[PDB]
Amino acid sequence: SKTIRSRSIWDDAHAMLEKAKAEGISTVWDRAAEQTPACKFGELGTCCRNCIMGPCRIANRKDGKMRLGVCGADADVIVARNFGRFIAGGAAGHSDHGRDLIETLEAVAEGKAPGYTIRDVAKLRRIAAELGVADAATRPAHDVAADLVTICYNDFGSRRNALAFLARAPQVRRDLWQRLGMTPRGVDREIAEMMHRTHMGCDNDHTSLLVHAARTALADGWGGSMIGTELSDILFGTPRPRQSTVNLGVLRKDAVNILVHGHNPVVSEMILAATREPAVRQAAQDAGAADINVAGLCCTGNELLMRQGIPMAGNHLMTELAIVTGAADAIVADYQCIMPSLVQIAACYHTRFVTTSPKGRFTGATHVEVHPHNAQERCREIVMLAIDAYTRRDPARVDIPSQPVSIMSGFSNEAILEALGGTPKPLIDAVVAGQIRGFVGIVGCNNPKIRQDSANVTLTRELIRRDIMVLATGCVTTAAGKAGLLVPEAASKAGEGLAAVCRSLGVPPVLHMGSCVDNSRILQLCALLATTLGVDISDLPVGASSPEWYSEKAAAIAMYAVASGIPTHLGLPPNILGSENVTAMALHGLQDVVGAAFMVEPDPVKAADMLEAHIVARRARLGL
Amino acid sequence: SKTIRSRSIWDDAHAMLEKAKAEGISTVWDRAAEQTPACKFGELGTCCRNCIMGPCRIANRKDGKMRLGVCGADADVIVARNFGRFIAGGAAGHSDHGRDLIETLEAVAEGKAPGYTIRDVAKLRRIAAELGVADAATRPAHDVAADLVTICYNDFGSRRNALAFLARAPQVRRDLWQRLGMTPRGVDREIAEMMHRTHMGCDNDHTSLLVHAARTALADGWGGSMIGTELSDILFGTPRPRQSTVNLGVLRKDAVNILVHGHNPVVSEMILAATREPAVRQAAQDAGAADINVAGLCCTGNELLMRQGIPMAGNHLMTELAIVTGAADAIVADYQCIMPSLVQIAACYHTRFVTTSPKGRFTGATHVEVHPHNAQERCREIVMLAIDAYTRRDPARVDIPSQPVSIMSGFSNEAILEALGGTPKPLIDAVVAGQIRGFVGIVGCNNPKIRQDSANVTLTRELIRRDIMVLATGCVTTAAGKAGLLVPEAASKAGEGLAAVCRSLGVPPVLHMGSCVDNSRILQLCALLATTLGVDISDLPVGASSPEWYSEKAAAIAMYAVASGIPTHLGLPPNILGSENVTAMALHGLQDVVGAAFMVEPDPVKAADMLEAHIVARRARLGLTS
Ligand code: SF4
Ligand code: SF4
């Protein structure tokens, strides 16, 4: 099938697309084909639905009609307001995730979270001292956790002048944010102000609207996401380099396969612990299974990969196909980027679709709500439902298509610095010498409009060939993994300088740094290098790219990378092209304001050319 | 012009529409006509733009295509998510307003707000004692204010189980909210969670989404709005009954006319103070003006009316027409519902359009940013700009069309209770006796799709005829005022029972209770009556109506009225009709959950029939006669 081949570059995707077609199961690609018309105005950003004087659409007509909304708003305001709410939704996704981590650490500190502990007490004391907890090195760990909880909760209040983790940014970058009015003050406050600004008759200046969009996204990267990353390491362990596998072949015919899906490790970490209890393992053996096999999907799978080495079944557009294998006995979901089509496809088989969060409700799903105080009990119940569903699996409909590909994961900043001997100096020297010319974080998703992982893999190959080290998060993890680029042996596919540095360190040329919230690790690493060198983040030879993005969260990540001084490439444009002024601001105007701008380029080789050109220019301004 | 007559019921609007037509000035009605080819999918709520796998539209096609979005979401999820974000935008409008009041009270308590004071120390001590401030009756006033500021800020945090003012609601209503998962916890938090829930692949159940929409709106009415109302009374005075005038005739040809527009009294109160300084009045007289005349627009005008008796120039669709009079020397705006067309229309005259808030930026406006620490200085500078613009006014293009209509305003709950002798008992006795059969809060805006104020005025007349007292806020204030219903003499236009009670108290049959944020006053009054009688708010003979609404803030008000147990009528439907399940939930399903539901009815007489039917049924459940 030429159509099936055009939808992905992977054999395991192709095999399940054939199977789904033979069984009459429609997938995300089929629904994408139906929605291709949609609305030109929605794509251009020139449709407004923010009050019922409208809806209004801005058109270019010879009679001059429909140039303004009923309230008088023009294309610039309407597009900027739509883009702002788009960003606020992405920031809110990371905000609630970070807030949930605070609640969990507070529950542990109060002794009200059976089965949860502080896995990394050393990191707890370090982070707490960094944020100003008195005597964080010597006081009882639960006292220290409670004080860190109070600081993090205060960043979710309305009385701070600047977020707590913002102190990591170099002084020149904080002074710039202050002059611009971009300093993030409260994680929830910026989201709430954006919704106020975008109400009819509030903020009607596209420049003002975009400035607060930067402030809202900065409250994510230096707030919601960074709190989520650091507290997750404290609760569940700081990642260290380890080996694992990826693709649909990680599912086992002889085992109970449980796929964790969503973003929150607070649930998936306890699911994993439940599968290790003797009575639970006995129920699986009583059912005829050889073992219980947990495999990861999306960001919560990335989290289990970084901290436990749990194999990854696939990324965004693989999620439906994982059920089509016939071996998915249960999907355990929390929230974000869980396509509701999985509920209907699970109904085609024996698969149980289990929801666990009060925020992630899916009509028709089996809801076993998980909170810290009952997670150990509830996650036990959830694994038992998976074992029961295993006994109802139809063996004739099982087809696990591929053999898993080996990967190396767990490259937190702590692991990176340890690999360098404890300081960033060897990394700076390699950059100064030109063996590593720069770094690019590839952090994108999948999008049905782009052949799955074609741009992710091509861009990754292009960059490491040019001695540009790649930092991979999100869906790119599975893409780079299946291409065999996440192992130390892949240095043979990097340039001479990068290959030599990788072989001397024993690391791959592509470092897996975690989930989408773990893009905050990349902010931290950039901030560390800039502070060490005494320059701004906008002076570093760095870049960010999302070749196949789709979600509001990806746009928020791109926005706070740009606002932090990181040139950011997107494979597809956001819904803003209906305003030339907003588009020019995103592509060019922001360069004069924050020292970086967006790039839109669907050709991954041309994308690599543009990212390299920025890296080269920044190398020149550093005198290298 | 038949078209001009069809656009409003008021003579002052007709004259300015005729004037605008001859001068080639397009108004909101003209732009509404251009946008009448409104997207069907946007109107039905079945278009989703929440990711760039889309946009997606759900259609009812013969070939069965486009039944689901690319992610698999159906019409129920897509409509419920769009409505949730719609509600969050309205709640965020009130949230930021209340937050600004907290900052102003904090600035006063620290002595960093020249020209601001605690105007109502007595209410400060009462509110602070109510929320748990230790020794609020005797401690220094600035110390008490600082502790109340801390309590209010904590409601804008993420560590509360329930908002502070939620304790006003009856226990039965709080227990119901708790079981349903509707208890509002943080003013900003509920807004943020709604944006998280409506992200792709998060909340994909329309019932769950609608329940959190109720929780988000409750964080407004019992949080952002209620904090805004009470702190505004503390900072600028608790309203008491007073006389004033309304309509475009409140503008004076011989004076410098300054129109305050927006929602925040922190700015308009200092503008008024600036126009009262002797040196500023001297510059106006030196320029040839008899005086400086401040007149109000929209909610900030409602606030100046309630606390200072400052006359109101007009409501939503009058804002453009006020500049067309040719006598508007300056518009001073803060934020919310300020149409950016005013900037272009001001450019057709001498009028200065001044913005004052970092949140309300308008391209091409004159920005003089106002904060508590510099408000006294900046507002003086702003009034001077108005005097200068007055000297450039074209006398030939001036046309102030009408004579002002007298109104009575200032009916805070404190004023109502004082008129009743200090307790609600005389009011309860009148309801039990059947002289006052029920209460309806009419809280709507204007909408170009409805002839201006035709439904607002007709519904108000229908209700008071049936002995149903009307509580008026927002744009309804100007509507009821211009019809002469905001004066005690209007008791002659009410039924026999309501007229007798009004004459016994000396009050109009329509009580102006303030701005849109002051709908929290109506929540407080309903909660007080329910608590006194030992029943739920859903047992009281009450209703709420928004016959001509348009904004997200209006939908948030309607949602938290319903969620609090108040049957709420809307003249126009929200963009939800593309989902029958969501529509059925809003119109019927919610009745079984929170004891009230939405009503959509564009006929104001039928709306009065439906509101009265609920009042009668609740009267029976209380064991009262009709
Ligand atoms: S806010 Fe303005 S542009 Fe948007 S729908 Fe309302 S009237 Fe139209
Ligand atoms: S969230 Fe779902 S329905 Fe909405 S645009 Fe994205 S794919 Fe389409």
PDB file of N, CA and C in Angstrom, chain A residues 31 34-35 38 47 49-50 52 54 57 66 68 70-71 85 96 99 103 106 150 153 158-159 196-197 200-201 204-205 336-337 340 358 361 363 449 550 552, chain B residues 31 34-35 47 49-50 52 54-55 57 66 68-71 85 96 99 106 150 153 158-159 196-197 200-201 204-205 336-338 340 358 361 363 449 550 552:
ATOM      1  N   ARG A  31      -8.857   9.863  10.149  1.00  0.00           N
ATOM      2  CA  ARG A  31      -9.586  11.048  10.589  1.00  0.00           C
ATOM      3  C   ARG A  31      -8.908  12.328  10.121  1.00  0.00           C
ATOM      4  N   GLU A  34     -10.119  13.153   6.699  1.00  0.00           N
ATOM      5  CA  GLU A  34     -11.461  13.729   6.670  1.00  0.00           C
ATOM      6  C   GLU A  34     -11.467  15.207   7.041  1.00  0.00           C
ATOM      7  N   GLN A  35     -10.560  15.640   7.915  1.00  0.00           N
ATOM      8  CA  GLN A  35     -10.564  17.001   8.439  1.00  0.00           C
ATOM      9  C   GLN A  35      -9.700  17.970   7.637  1.00  0.00           C
ATOM     10  N   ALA A  38     -11.607  21.606   6.806  1.00  0.00           N
ATOM     11  CA  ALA A  38     -11.774  22.321   8.070  1.00  0.00           C
ATOM     12  C   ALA A  38     -12.203  23.767   7.863  1.00  0.00           C
ATOM     13  N   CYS A  47     -10.210  33.910  12.801  1.00  0.00           N
ATOM     14  CA  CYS A  47     -11.565  33.688  13.294  1.00  0.00           C
ATOM     15  C   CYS A  47     -11.560  33.924  14.798  1.00  0.00           C
ATOM     16  N   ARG A  49     -13.974  33.856  18.372  1.00  0.00           N
ATOM     17  CA  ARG A  49     -15.188  33.342  18.991  1.00  0.00           C
ATOM     18  C   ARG A  49     -15.242  33.710  20.467  1.00  0.00           C
ATOM     19  N   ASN A  50     -14.645  34.838  20.840  1.00  0.00           N
ATOM     20  CA  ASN A  50     -14.480  35.197  22.243  1.00  0.00           C
ATOM     21  C   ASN A  50     -15.691  35.912  22.836  1.00  0.00           C
ATOM     22  N   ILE A  52     -20.342  36.511  21.920  1.00  0.00           N
ATOM     23  CA  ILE A  52     -21.448  36.194  21.024  1.00  0.00           C
ATOM     24  C   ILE A  52     -22.012  37.449  20.351  1.00  0.00           C
ATOM     25  N   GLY A  54     -19.981  38.070  18.035  1.00  0.00           N
ATOM     26  CA  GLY A  54     -19.555  37.301  16.896  1.00  0.00           C
ATOM     27  C   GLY A  54     -20.254  35.956  16.831  1.00  0.00           C
ATOM     28  N   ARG A  57     -14.956  36.745  11.503  1.00  0.00           N
ATOM     29  CA  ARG A  57     -13.819  36.360  10.682  1.00  0.00           C
ATOM     30  C   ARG A  57     -13.341  37.576   9.908  1.00  0.00           C
ATOM     31  N   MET A  66     -15.792  43.215   6.443  1.00  0.00           N
ATOM     32  CA  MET A  66     -15.222  42.176   7.307  1.00  0.00           C
ATOM     33  C   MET A  66     -13.719  42.365   7.505  1.00  0.00           C
ATOM     34  N   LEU A  68     -12.803  44.205  10.214  1.00  0.00           N
ATOM     35  CA  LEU A  68     -12.753  44.308  11.662  1.00  0.00           C
ATOM     36  C   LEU A  68     -13.831  43.424  12.268  1.00  0.00           C
ATOM     37  N   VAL A  70     -16.826  42.699  15.194  1.00  0.00           N
ATOM     38  CA  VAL A  70     -17.969  43.522  15.592  1.00  0.00           C
ATOM     39  C   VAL A  70     -17.549  44.550  16.637  1.00  0.00           C
ATOM     40  N   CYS A  71     -16.648  44.166  17.544  1.00  0.00           N
ATOM     41  CA  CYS A  71     -16.124  45.099  18.534  1.00  0.00           C
ATOM     42  C   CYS A  71     -15.102  46.070  17.958  1.00  0.00           C
ATOM     43  N   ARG A  85      -4.049  32.539  23.815  1.00  0.00           N
ATOM     44  CA  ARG A  85      -4.799  31.473  24.474  1.00  0.00           C
ATOM     45  C   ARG A  85      -4.240  30.103  24.122  1.00  0.00           C
ATOM     46  N   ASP A  96      -0.446  22.306  35.807  1.00  0.00           N
ATOM     47  CA  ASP A  96      -1.172  21.346  36.631  1.00  0.00           C
ATOM     48  C   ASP A  96      -0.322  20.127  36.940  1.00  0.00           C
ATOM     49  N   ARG A  99       1.964  21.224  39.668  1.00  0.00           N
ATOM     50  CA  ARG A  99       1.182  21.356  40.894  1.00  0.00           C
ATOM     51  C   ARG A  99       0.920  19.998  41.529  1.00  0.00           C
ATOM     52  N   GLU A 103       1.862  18.550  45.405  1.00  0.00           N
ATOM     53  CA  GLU A 103       0.924  17.872  46.296  1.00  0.00           C
ATOM     54  C   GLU A 103       1.469  16.533  46.754  1.00  0.00           C
ATOM     55  N   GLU A 106       4.253  17.098  49.250  1.00  0.00           N
ATOM     56  CA  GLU A 106       3.627  17.493  50.509  1.00  0.00           C
ATOM     57  C   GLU A 106       3.021  16.290  51.224  1.00  0.00           C
ATOM     58  N   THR A 150       6.362  24.736  50.446  1.00  0.00           N
ATOM     59  CA  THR A 150       5.817  26.079  50.646  1.00  0.00           C
ATOM     60  C   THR A 150       6.348  27.055  49.602  1.00  0.00           C
ATOM     61  N   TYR A 153       4.622  26.162  46.216  1.00  0.00           N
ATOM     62  CA  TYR A 153       3.241  26.632  46.244  1.00  0.00           C
ATOM     63  C   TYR A 153       3.170  28.150  46.123  1.00  0.00           C
ATOM     64  N   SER A 158       0.088  34.726  44.139  1.00  0.00           N
ATOM     65  CA  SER A 158      -0.008  36.017  43.468  1.00  0.00           C
ATOM     66  C   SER A 158       0.786  37.111  44.181  1.00  0.00           C
ATOM     67  N   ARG A 159       1.793  36.742  44.979  1.00  0.00           N
ATOM     68  CA  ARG A 159       2.552  37.713  45.755  1.00  0.00           C
ATOM     69  C   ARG A 159       4.038  37.764  45.414  1.00  0.00           C
ATOM     70  N   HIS A 196      -7.655  36.939  30.852  1.00  0.00           N
ATOM     71  CA  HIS A 196      -8.255  38.259  31.027  1.00  0.00           C
ATOM     72  C   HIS A 196      -7.916  39.179  29.857  1.00  0.00           C
ATOM     73  N   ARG A 197      -6.642  39.202  29.453  1.00  0.00           N
ATOM     74  CA  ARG A 197      -6.208  40.071  28.360  1.00  0.00           C
ATOM     75  C   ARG A 197      -6.937  39.754  27.060  1.00  0.00           C
ATOM     76  N   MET A 200     -12.824  40.130  25.304  1.00  0.00           N
ATOM     77  CA  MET A 200     -13.220  41.276  24.487  1.00  0.00           C
ATOM     78  C   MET A 200     -12.940  42.585  25.214  1.00  0.00           C
ATOM     79  N   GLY A 201     -12.343  43.532  24.495  1.00  0.00           N
ATOM     80  CA  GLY A 201     -12.186  44.862  25.044  1.00  0.00           C
ATOM     81  C   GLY A 201     -11.197  44.990  26.180  1.00  0.00           C
ATOM     82  N   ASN A 204      -5.881  45.105  23.404  1.00  0.00           N
ATOM     83  CA  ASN A 204      -6.081  45.199  21.962  1.00  0.00           C
ATOM     84  C   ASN A 204      -4.841  45.778  21.288  1.00  0.00           C
ATOM     85  N   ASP A 205      -3.674  45.237  21.630  1.00  0.00           N
ATOM     86  CA  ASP A 205      -2.412  45.594  20.994  1.00  0.00           C
ATOM     87  C   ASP A 205      -1.606  44.318  20.813  1.00  0.00           C
ATOM     88  N   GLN A 336      -3.287  14.399  29.355  1.00  0.00           N
ATOM     89  CA  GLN A 336      -2.591  15.101  28.276  1.00  0.00           C
ATOM     90  C   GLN A 336      -2.173  14.194  27.124  1.00  0.00           C
ATOM     91  N   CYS A 337      -2.620  14.550  25.919  1.00  0.00           N
ATOM     92  CA  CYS A 337      -2.219  13.921  24.660  1.00  0.00           C
ATOM     93  C   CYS A 337      -2.632  12.455  24.568  1.00  0.00           C
ATOM     94  N   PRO A 340      -8.746  10.264  22.602  1.00  0.00           N
ATOM     95  CA  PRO A 340      -9.942   9.509  23.013  1.00  0.00           C
ATOM     96  C   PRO A 340     -10.332   8.403  22.043  1.00  0.00           C
ATOM     97  N   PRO A 358      -8.713  12.753  38.183  1.00  0.00           N
ATOM     98  CA  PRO A 358      -9.974  13.502  38.095  1.00  0.00           C
ATOM     99  C   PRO A 358      -9.985  14.508  36.959  1.00  0.00           C
ATOM    100  N   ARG A 361     -10.785  12.552  32.389  1.00  0.00           N
ATOM    101  CA  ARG A 361     -11.963  11.707  32.264  1.00  0.00           C
ATOM    102  C   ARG A 361     -12.251  11.425  30.795  1.00  0.00           C
ATOM    103  N   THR A 363     -15.153   9.425  28.441  1.00  0.00           N
ATOM    104  CA  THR A 363     -16.448   8.751  28.407  1.00  0.00           C
ATOM    105  C   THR A 363     -16.282   7.293  27.994  1.00  0.00           C
ATOM    106  N   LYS A 449       0.083  15.286   9.423  1.00  0.00           N
ATOM    107  CA  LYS A 449       0.413  15.995   8.191  1.00  0.00           C
ATOM    108  C   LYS A 449       1.838  15.724   7.718  1.00  0.00           C
ATOM    109  N   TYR A 550       2.479  19.311  17.265  1.00  0.00           N
ATOM    110  CA  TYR A 550       1.047  19.558  17.109  1.00  0.00           C
ATOM    111  C   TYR A 550       0.391  20.261  18.293  1.00  0.00           C
ATOM    112  N   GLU A 552      -0.543  22.382  21.996  1.00  0.00           N
ATOM    113  CA  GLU A 552      -0.329  23.672  22.644  1.00  0.00           C
ATOM    114  C   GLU A 552       0.905  23.656  23.540  1.00  0.00           C
TER     115      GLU A 552
ATOM    116  N   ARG B  31     -20.768  46.983  11.761  1.00  0.00           N
ATOM    117  CA  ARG B  31     -19.854  45.846  11.752  1.00  0.00           C
ATOM    118  C   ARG B  31     -20.586  44.546  12.050  1.00  0.00           C
ATOM    119  N   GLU B  34     -21.943  43.384   8.828  1.00  0.00           N
ATOM    120  CA  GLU B  34     -20.922  42.798   7.964  1.00  0.00           C
ATOM    121  C   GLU B  34     -20.582  41.374   8.385  1.00  0.00           C
ATOM    122  N   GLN B  35     -20.648  41.082   9.681  1.00  0.00           N
ATOM    123  CA  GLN B  35     -20.273  39.782  10.216  1.00  0.00           C
ATOM    124  C   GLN B  35     -21.453  38.824  10.302  1.00  0.00           C
ATOM    125  N   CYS B  47     -16.449  23.647  16.226  1.00  0.00           N
ATOM    126  CA  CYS B  47     -15.137  23.862  15.635  1.00  0.00           C
ATOM    127  C   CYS B  47     -14.116  23.870  16.758  1.00  0.00           C
ATOM    128  N   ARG B  49      -9.905  24.311  17.664  1.00  0.00           N
ATOM    129  CA  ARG B  49      -8.631  24.855  17.215  1.00  0.00           C
ATOM    130  C   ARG B  49      -7.560  24.658  18.278  1.00  0.00           C
ATOM    131  N   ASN B  50      -7.684  23.603  19.073  1.00  0.00           N
ATOM    132  CA  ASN B  50      -6.842  23.433  20.247  1.00  0.00           C
ATOM    133  C   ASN B  50      -5.514  22.748  19.942  1.00  0.00           C
ATOM    134  N   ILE B  52      -2.710  21.775  16.196  1.00  0.00           N
ATOM    135  CA  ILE B  52      -2.526  21.897  14.754  1.00  0.00           C
ATOM    136  C   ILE B  52      -2.494  20.529  14.065  1.00  0.00           C
ATOM    137  N   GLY B  54      -5.515  19.718  13.929  1.00  0.00           N
ATOM    138  CA  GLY B  54      -6.656  20.351  13.323  1.00  0.00           C
ATOM    139  C   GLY B  54      -6.262  21.622  12.598  1.00  0.00           C
ATOM    140  N   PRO B  55      -7.176  22.609  12.533  1.00  0.00           N
ATOM    141  CA  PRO B  55      -8.492  22.641  13.186  1.00  0.00           C
ATOM    142  C   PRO B  55      -9.471  21.584  12.674  1.00  0.00           C
ATOM    143  N   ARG B  57     -13.721  20.394  12.497  1.00  0.00           N
ATOM    144  CA  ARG B  57     -15.126  20.713  12.675  1.00  0.00           C
ATOM    145  C   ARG B  57     -15.934  19.427  12.644  1.00  0.00           C
ATOM    146  N   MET B  66     -16.304  13.338   9.078  1.00  0.00           N
ATOM    147  CA  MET B  66     -16.118  14.466   9.996  1.00  0.00           C
ATOM    148  C   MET B  66     -17.039  14.367  11.209  1.00  0.00           C
ATOM    149  N   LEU B  68     -15.757  12.951  13.959  1.00  0.00           N
ATOM    150  CA  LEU B  68     -14.782  13.049  15.034  1.00  0.00           C
ATOM    151  C   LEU B  68     -13.626  13.942  14.608  1.00  0.00           C
ATOM    152  N   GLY B  69     -12.976  14.555  15.591  1.00  0.00           N
ATOM    153  CA  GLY B  69     -11.741  15.261  15.329  1.00  0.00           C
ATOM    154  C   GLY B  69     -10.604  14.291  15.068  1.00  0.00           C
ATOM    155  N   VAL B  70      -9.466  14.847  14.645  1.00  0.00           N
ATOM    156  CA  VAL B  70      -8.313  14.011  14.313  1.00  0.00           C
ATOM    157  C   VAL B  70      -7.885  13.179  15.521  1.00  0.00           C
ATOM    158  N   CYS B  71      -7.977  13.750  16.724  1.00  0.00           N
ATOM    159  CA  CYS B  71      -7.660  13.006  17.940  1.00  0.00           C
ATOM    160  C   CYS B  71      -8.754  12.027  18.347  1.00  0.00           C
ATOM    161  N   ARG B  85     -13.592  26.961  28.146  1.00  0.00           N
ATOM    162  CA  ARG B  85     -12.664  28.071  27.950  1.00  0.00           C
ATOM    163  C   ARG B  85     -13.401  29.401  27.877  1.00  0.00           C
ATOM    164  N   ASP B  96      -8.790  38.994  37.666  1.00  0.00           N
ATOM    165  CA  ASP B  96      -7.770  40.036  37.610  1.00  0.00           C
ATOM    166  C   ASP B  96      -8.260  41.343  38.217  1.00  0.00           C
ATOM    167  N   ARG B  99      -7.975  40.922  41.943  1.00  0.00           N
ATOM    168  CA  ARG B  99      -6.563  40.942  42.316  1.00  0.00           C
ATOM    169  C   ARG B  99      -6.028  42.367  42.394  1.00  0.00           C
ATOM    170  N   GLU B 106      -3.455  46.600  49.732  1.00  0.00           N
ATOM    171  CA  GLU B 106      -2.121  46.374  50.281  1.00  0.00           C
ATOM    172  C   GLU B 106      -1.268  47.638  50.194  1.00  0.00           C
ATOM    173  N   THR B 150      -3.767  39.399  53.159  1.00  0.00           N
ATOM    174  CA  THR B 150      -3.143  38.080  53.142  1.00  0.00           C
ATOM    175  C   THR B 150      -4.174  36.983  52.914  1.00  0.00           C
ATOM    176  N   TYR B 153      -5.227  37.165  49.208  1.00  0.00           N
ATOM    177  CA  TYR B 153      -4.163  36.631  48.363  1.00  0.00           C
ATOM    178  C   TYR B 153      -4.115  35.108  48.417  1.00  0.00           C
ATOM    179  N   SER B 158      -2.833  28.226  45.858  1.00  0.00           N
ATOM    180  CA  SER B 158      -3.128  26.839  45.511  1.00  0.00           C
ATOM    181  C   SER B 158      -3.151  25.913  46.724  1.00  0.00           C
ATOM    182  N   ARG B 159      -3.374  26.442  47.932  1.00  0.00           N
ATOM    183  CA  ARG B 159      -3.339  25.620  49.137  1.00  0.00           C
ATOM    184  C   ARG B 159      -4.655  25.572  49.904  1.00  0.00           C
ATOM    185  N   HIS B 196      -5.990  23.470  31.339  1.00  0.00           N
ATOM    186  CA  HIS B 196      -5.352  22.162  31.253  1.00  0.00           C
ATOM    187  C   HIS B 196      -6.339  21.111  30.761  1.00  0.00           C
ATOM    188  N   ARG B 197      -7.547  21.094  31.339  1.00  0.00           N
ATOM    189  CA  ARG B 197      -8.552  20.098  30.975  1.00  0.00           C
ATOM    190  C   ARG B 197      -8.910  20.163  29.497  1.00  0.00           C
ATOM    191  N   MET B 200      -5.746  19.206  24.297  1.00  0.00           N
ATOM    192  CA  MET B 200      -5.951  17.929  23.619  1.00  0.00           C
ATOM    193  C   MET B 200      -5.607  16.767  24.538  1.00  0.00           C
ATOM    194  N   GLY B 201      -6.483  15.771  24.555  1.00  0.00           N
ATOM    195  CA  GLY B 201      -6.174  14.540  25.244  1.00  0.00           C
ATOM    196  C   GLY B 201      -6.126  14.628  26.750  1.00  0.00           C
ATOM    197  N   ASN B 204     -11.850  14.465  28.397  1.00  0.00           N
ATOM    198  CA  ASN B 204     -12.670  14.117  27.245  1.00  0.00           C
ATOM    199  C   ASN B 204     -14.002  13.515  27.674  1.00  0.00           C
ATOM    200  N   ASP B 205     -14.673  14.163  28.624  1.00  0.00           N
ATOM    201  CA  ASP B 205     -16.019  13.789  29.041  1.00  0.00           C
ATOM    202  C   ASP B 205     -16.796  15.071  29.290  1.00  0.00           C
ATOM    203  N   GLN B 336     -11.557  45.739  29.919  1.00  0.00           N
ATOM    204  CA  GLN B 336     -12.749  44.912  29.737  1.00  0.00           C
ATOM    205  C   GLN B 336     -13.898  45.652  29.061  1.00  0.00           C
ATOM    206  N   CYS B 337     -14.373  45.094  27.948  1.00  0.00           N
ATOM    207  CA  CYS B 337     -15.550  45.565  27.226  1.00  0.00           C
ATOM    208  C   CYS B 337     -15.378  46.976  26.678  1.00  0.00           C
ATOM    209  N   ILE B 338     -14.136  47.418  26.499  1.00  0.00           N
ATOM    210  CA  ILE B 338     -13.842  48.691  25.851  1.00  0.00           C
ATOM    211  C   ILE B 338     -13.578  48.384  24.379  1.00  0.00           C
ATOM    212  N   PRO B 340     -12.325  48.512  20.827  1.00  0.00           N
ATOM    213  CA  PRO B 340     -11.221  49.265  20.208  1.00  0.00           C
ATOM    214  C   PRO B 340     -11.668  50.193  19.091  1.00  0.00           C
ATOM    215  N   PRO B 358      -1.771  48.470  32.285  1.00  0.00           N
ATOM    216  CA  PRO B 358      -0.882  47.638  31.462  1.00  0.00           C
ATOM    217  C   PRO B 358      -1.594  46.459  30.824  1.00  0.00           C
ATOM    218  N   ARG B 361      -4.113  47.597  26.748  1.00  0.00           N
ATOM    219  CA  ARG B 361      -3.376  48.351  25.742  1.00  0.00           C
ATOM    220  C   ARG B 361      -4.168  48.387  24.441  1.00  0.00           C
ATOM    221  N   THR B 363      -3.741  49.869  20.521  1.00  0.00           N
ATOM    222  CA  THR B 363      -2.868  50.481  19.528  1.00  0.00           C
ATOM    223  C   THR B 363      -3.410  51.846  19.120  1.00  0.00           C
ATOM    224  N   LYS B 449     -27.422  41.961  18.007  1.00  0.00           N
ATOM    225  CA  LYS B 449     -28.439  41.078  17.446  1.00  0.00           C
ATOM    226  C   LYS B 449     -29.832  41.337  18.010  1.00  0.00           C
ATOM    227  N   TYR B 550     -23.631  39.316  25.831  1.00  0.00           N
ATOM    228  CA  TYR B 550     -22.665  38.972  24.789  1.00  0.00           C
ATOM    229  C   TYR B 550     -21.336  38.433  25.309  1.00  0.00           C
ATOM    230  N   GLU B 552     -17.997  36.902  27.668  1.00  0.00           N
ATOM    231  CA  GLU B 552     -17.625  35.740  28.470  1.00  0.00           C
ATOM    232  C   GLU B 552     -17.924  35.972  29.949  1.00  0.00           C
TER     233      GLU B 552
END
